[PDB]
């Protein structure tokens, strides 16, 4: 029984151009545990992204947190790109900021 990941993108603090912050991508409810997650800046992979140790919920589905410290500017766009066996194509979830 394969379960597709739920993907949620959020920052640690309100977005303020030129102020240091953390970009998070929480991927959860998936099965099997094999998963590829990248954080993107203007469509390019962010290097040296950190992640929590793999864990699972009561229903045995897996979850992970990916995060990185970043400094947003007015012209930058950020997203989370996820690859899993349940996805025919990678799913890109954008970071929404005003």
């Amino acid at each position: 029984i394969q379960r597709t990941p739920k993907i949620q993108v959020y920052s640690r603090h309100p977005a303020e151009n030129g102020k240091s912050n953390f970009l998070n991508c929480y991927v959860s409810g998936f099965h099997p545990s094999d998963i590829e997650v990248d954080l993107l800046k203007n469509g390019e992979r962010i290097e040296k992204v950190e992640h929590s140790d793999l864990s699972f919920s009561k229903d045995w589905s897996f979850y992970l947190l990916y995060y990185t410290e970043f400094t947003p500017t007015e012209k930058d766009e950020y997203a989370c790109r996820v690859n899993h066996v349940t996805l025919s194509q990678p799913k890109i979830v954008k970071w929404d900021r005003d």
Binding site: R12, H13, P32, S52, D53, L65, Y67
Partner: protein, 270 residues
């Protein structure tokens, strides 16, 4: 409040596997297994609990031998048990009350009850056959019972004390407002973000003065890398009705001084 261990074993083929193990005091990770050095990793200074170094060495030795035994056992009986590669075994055990459950391919398979492994009736003949292999040695099962009934309760109380300064800390939230990205025609989505709070229970509502807006849709409480929590609460409103709206946050750390933000300024826009 419950101490439990999370065990993930992936069997990609007969010659390749991946083992991941961690210890938890509810939402809080306290320990990790190092697959390379085959040693217990203490995530906090208090993670050693009220237990000694000699007691920790014996626990470490018992875990190291039982994992080599598990991987060899599963490999040896995979065919008879009808386990086809690639497959994953998950185990969770601990005390809240005590439990030890095992899943195969992300579904309930077998569990340890009192002094033996019992198959989940739905898991069928495979799970009955696995329990036969798991219950081969009664002395090993008595060790498992004693770990769950005696060693586990002694550990959780002696951990909640040592980590008291951490688990009982109060961290104040911060909040901010933004526009939501998927509203319908003539409507807006107002988003209230709440972050950096600890412990987990929080109250967040869109309001019109003292009136709670029952269209408030609270999302999941999400984790942050620093151990605090995050939540977003959205409200769908008609474009000509976003006036006098506020987001109100209540949290144990605020001691009755709620955070209140107003849909105002450039968000209106004025």
């Amino acid at each position: 409040l419950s101490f439990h261990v999370i065990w993930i074993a992936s069997f990609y083929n007969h010659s390749w596997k991946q083992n991941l193990v961690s210890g938890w005091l509810s939402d809080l990770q306290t320990h990790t297994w190092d697959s390379n050095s085959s040693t217990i990793v203490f995530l906090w200074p208090w993670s050693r609990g009220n237990f000694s170094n000699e007691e920790w060495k014996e626990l470490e030795t018992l875990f190291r031998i039982r994992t080599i035994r598990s991987f060899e056992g599963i490999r040896r009986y995979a065919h008879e048990l009808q386990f086809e590669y690639p497959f994953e075994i998950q185990v969770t055990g601990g005390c809240e009350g005590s439990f030890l459950q095992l899943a195969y391919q992300g579904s309930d398979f077998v569990s340890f009850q009192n002094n033996s492994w019992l198959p989940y009736p739905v898991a069928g003949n495979m799970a009955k056959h696995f329990c036969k292999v798991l219950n081969q040695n009664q002395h090993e099962n008595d060790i498992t019972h004693n770990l769950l009934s005696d060693t586990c309760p002694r550990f959780i109380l002696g951990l909640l004390d040592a980590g008291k300064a951490h688990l009982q800390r109060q961290v104040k939230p911060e909040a901010w407002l933004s526009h939501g990205p998927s509203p319908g025609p003539g409507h807006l989505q107002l988003v209230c973000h709440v972050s950096g709070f600890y412990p987990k229970p929080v109250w967040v509502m869109w309001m019109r003065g003292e009136q709670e807006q029952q269209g408030t849709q609270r999302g999941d409480i999400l984790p942050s890398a620093d151990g605090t929590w995050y939540l977003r609460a959205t409200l769908e409103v008609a474009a000509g009705e976003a006036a006098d709206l506020s987001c109100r946050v209540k949290h144990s750390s605020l001691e009755g001084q709620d955070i209140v933000l107003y849909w105002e300024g450039s968000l209106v826009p004025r």
